[model samples]
Target: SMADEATRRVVSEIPVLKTNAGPRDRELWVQRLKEEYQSLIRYVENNKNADNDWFRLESNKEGTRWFGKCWYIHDLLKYEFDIEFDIPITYPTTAPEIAVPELDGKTAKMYRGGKIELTDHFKPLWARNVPKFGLAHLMALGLGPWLAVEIPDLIQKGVIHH
Candidate 1:
């Protein structure tokens, strides 16, 4: 099993490699955010190795809020969407809620009338990583896997990508 996992690693790019996961405790997470942001900035700027890869980052001019913009590109499918992370006044205790504008009606995973949705894969992965919060985690675990699962079904059923 160990050999297989390693062979898989060598054979394929990590299907979902996590980023910005540091300070997995509450005390030093914000600094981890800066590291996360810088990594995302670099990831977006490079976009060099893979095809159809995309990432973008933008924040409110006033700051303290930013959008995690991009798609999930993996072996199963490619799905594009963006999320807005509004840093909470009480962060670390709570991760920011997400705004997924692209999946407005096709999915049932959102909450609070679509302003936030941590449903399904996102809720559990994020909860387990609380205090380990990183904006990029939203991509590594949240939207990326969700899109990987959703894309093919939606296409076959004519509910999406039609």
Candidate 2:
């Protein structure tokens, strides 16, 4: 039921995406995207849900933060971190901002909280011709690299080394 609803919503919102992609590709990409978006939405849904050692919401005052689990080193390590979202999530056109706690610092250090300013990062690529560019897409772009790098460090520090 849940999968069906998710599939329906994604198909309806992104009718074109439903075509031209293989079933496995569509299922993996679309379902993952939907989960990511919904996780962010759930963070905005409540403040108490926002707490993890490696990451925390800067403020629940007006924004939201979504956290997800990451496994590193062939699943030998793991970590969790919050992805900040400046809300009123724009879709199919505008991108949402996603930042990390490390970005809050003014200077570089052992832990450079990786922060990504979406508008600035995606401005050059944000063309009206891109039909699928949206908050979810921007978020994946912003977090993908960071997760590959930072999450490993976090896992090493908190899990392996600790």
Candidate 3:
């Protein structure tokens, strides 16, 4: 009954979750959400060697099933990047509203270049049904030509300007 109720709730929310005005809007929304979810999982697993910032388990709360959260620094960065899956299930089919607590701005514009908007391009899907494949795919998608950008050198050497 718990699983059935959860499924029903998910199905009921689908319509409201996908309220756009296009012929294939629902399909498009689902596709994009799947892509974003897969991308983030792939990126984290690949980079961290099968390790994850978040781990899932059966919850003790009533009606609640499973939950997860990011525990690593890089994973936290990924979540903050709003690459998707920020608040568990809030923005499951849409982009997460990312706000850096350490930064003054509420957006991710500082990390953009030219026409590539990372935040807008990658939607966050915090669904529980997605699988993890690794992070190389995400790196390929997000980093593009700048995949070789070094984080240690940048952070330690003070190469970035905040």
Q: In candidate 3, what are the lDDT values of residues 1-162, reduced to their tens digit?
A: 675464444233122222221113456545545444454544445545635333221222221122233222332343222122122232233322322223223223433221123543233322332232112222333333221233333344554333
Best by lDDT: 1
Residue pair clashes in candidate 2: 102-113, 103-113
Q: Model 1 — TM-score against the truth?
A: 0.58
What TM-score would candidate 2 get against the native? 0.38
Off by over 4 Å in 1: 1-33, 42-52, 72-79, 115-130
Number of colliding residue pairs in each model: 0, 2, 6
Clashing pairs for model 1 are none
In terms of lDDT, model 2 sits at 0.40
Q: Please give, for residues 1-162, the per-residue lDDT of candidate 1 as tens digits.
A: 674354343323222223333334343445556555665555444444645356566766433577756666544566666767666655544566666766666666556544544455456545565554455555544555566566565676776562
Better of 1 and 3 by lDDT: 1
Worst 10 residues of 1 by lDDT: 10-19
